[PDB]
Amino acid sequence: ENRYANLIPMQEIKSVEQQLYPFDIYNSLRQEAPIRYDESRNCWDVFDYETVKYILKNPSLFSSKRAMEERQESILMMDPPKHTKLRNLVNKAFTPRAIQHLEGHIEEIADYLLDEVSSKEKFDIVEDFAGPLPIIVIAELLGVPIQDRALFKKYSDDLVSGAENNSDEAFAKMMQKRNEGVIFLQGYFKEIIAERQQNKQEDLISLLLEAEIDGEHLTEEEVLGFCILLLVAGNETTTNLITNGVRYMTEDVDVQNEVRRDISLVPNLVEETLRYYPPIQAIGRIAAEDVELGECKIKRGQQVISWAASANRDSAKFEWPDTFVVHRKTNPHVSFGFGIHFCLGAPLARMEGKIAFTKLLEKGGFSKVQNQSLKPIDSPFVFGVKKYEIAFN
Numbered sequence: 001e002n003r004y005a006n007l008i009p010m011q012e013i014k015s016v017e018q019q020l021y022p023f024d025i026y027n028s029l030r031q032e033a034p035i036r037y038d039e040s041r042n043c044w045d046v047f048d049y050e051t052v053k054y055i056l057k058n059p060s061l062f063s064s065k066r067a068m069e070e071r072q073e074s075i076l077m078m079d080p081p082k083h084t085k086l087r088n089l090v091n092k093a094f095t096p097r098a099i100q101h102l103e104g105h106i107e108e109i110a111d112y113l114l115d116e117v118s119s120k121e122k123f124d125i126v127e128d129f130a131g132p133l134p135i136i137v138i139a140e141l142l143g144v145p146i147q148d149r150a151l152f153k154k155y156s157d158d159l160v161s162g163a164e165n166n167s168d169e170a171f172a173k174m175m176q177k178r179n180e181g182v183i184f185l186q187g188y189f190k191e192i193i194a195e196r197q198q199n200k201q202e203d204l205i206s207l208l209l210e211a212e213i214d215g216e217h218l219t220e221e222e223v224l225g226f227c228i229l230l231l232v233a234g235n236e237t238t239t240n241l242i243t244n245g246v247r248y249m250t251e252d253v254d255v256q257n258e259v260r261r262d263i264s265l266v267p268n269l270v271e272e273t274l275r276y277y278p279p280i281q282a283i284g285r286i287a288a289e290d291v292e293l294g295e296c297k298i299k300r301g302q303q304v305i306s307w308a309a310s311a312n313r314d315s316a317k318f319e320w321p322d323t324f325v326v327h328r329k330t331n332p333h334v335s336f337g338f339g340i341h342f343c344l345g346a347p348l349a350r351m352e353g354k355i356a357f358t359k360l361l362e363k364g365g366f367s368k369v370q371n372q373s374l375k376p377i378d379s380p381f382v383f384g385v386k387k388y389e390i391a392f393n
């Protein structure tokens with residue numbers, strides 16, 4: 001069928017171990033052919049850094065309109081000029097300057113979460129820390145109560161899940177799970193939107209209902225698209241940033257110790273986690289016209305999957321591509337994308353990661369619980385684990 005290839009795993013990724021560390025496979029594929037058509041998924045894969053960046057930089061050539069006849073009327077799936085107008089509503093809300101005032105409060109949220117576990121021998125960094133903290137932050141930004149964090153996590157995670165394979169049964173099981181998260185989350189936000197239409201508040205949702213574009217209010221679908229995209233993007237990725245950073249720091253305790261002993265290295269650590277364990281592995285696009293990249297001729301309308309996970313380790317751009325380095329003078333990864341769709345939340349994600357890692361490090365040395373069976377999140381464009389247990393020494 002005409003299915004989104006970014007939800008369907010490559011055939012080159014087979015075992016669970018490979019899902020937990022697919023980067024050697026991506027590097028082999030990059031070397032064999034940095035651009036290849038995958039007949040199992042009816043798409044091109046692009047693995048090299050230069051071409052990924054070129055795709056993201058050329059929205060006129062590679063369109064973001066890739067909704068799978070799905071309910072995603074958000075800027076993520078829009079092209080200029082509509083993308084420009086809707087994004088200009090929110091861009092000033094997510095700058096470094098706009099968020100600086102949240103620093104103390106995010107530190108307070110992290111302190112409170114680590115207090116719920118101080119007297120716990122071992123704990124799940126996902127359930128007890130990395131999961132809650134991003135959800136709490138984005139809910140306060142949106143103006144939405146989320147006191148049942150586990151409920152919203154479940155359905156937010158649903159909207160990112162992919163297919164086990166390219167079969168018909170796997171795709172149907174995937175759409176069933178995605179549809180459940182749409183029902184609850186669309187419904188919840190429709191109710192909050194109606195509540196804000198009746199009585200405005202000092203929150204993002206209320207601002208979106210007052211804002212005018214081309215002399216008219218936003219459609220309900222458009223406000224809903226903002227609400228869900230901001231919710232899901234705001235928490236699912238950031239949780240994997242924190243978890244993946246804690247994963248690497250308990251796989252390589254040398255790095256953990258170094259950064260704990262020189263806390264000014266936390267920003268580099270955040271960037272290197274994003275490069276080395278990118279929460280988002282692949283970004284989709286649709287060819288807007290025929291495009292000749294190499295010898296490879298991309299025909300208008302074909303799916304084009306750009307692998308940030310591979311671009312981040314392209315040795316043509318990165319020294320020591322497969323080594324975790326906390327002393328890099330620059331780190332031009334594409335884990336937040338590039339160009340007009342560049343991650344709106346990157347300053348917020350970077351602040352949350354910086355505070356999350358700092359609070360963990362300051363609480364002392366910590367180790368992974370050995371003899372656990374890690375479970376990768378079931379989505380091929382995501383990289384993270386469902387659970388990750390650690391303990392303080």
Ligand code: HEB
Nearest residue numbers: 075076233234237238241279335336337341343344345349
């Ligand atoms: C708050 C909020 C938020 C947050 C926190 C975030 C966080 C994040 N994120 Fe973001 N993003 C977002 C919001 C967000 N986000 C949005 C809204 C978007 C869309 C934009 C446009 O489209 O323009 C993005 C976008 C984006 C992109 C691009 C895509 C394309 O190109 O298409 C990427 C890659 C990302 C990633 C990410 C990560 C990795 C993280 C963590 C770490 N993001």
Ligand SMILES: CCCCCCCC(=O)O
Nearest residue numbers: 071072159228229232233
């Ligand atoms: C983080 C990926 C984008 C999430 C927003 C799209 C919601 C949906 O699937 O309907």
Ligand SMILES: CCCCCC(=O)O
Nearest residue numbers: 006233280282283284
């Ligand atoms: C938060 C947006 C990540 C990009 C997901 C995709 O391109 O399918």
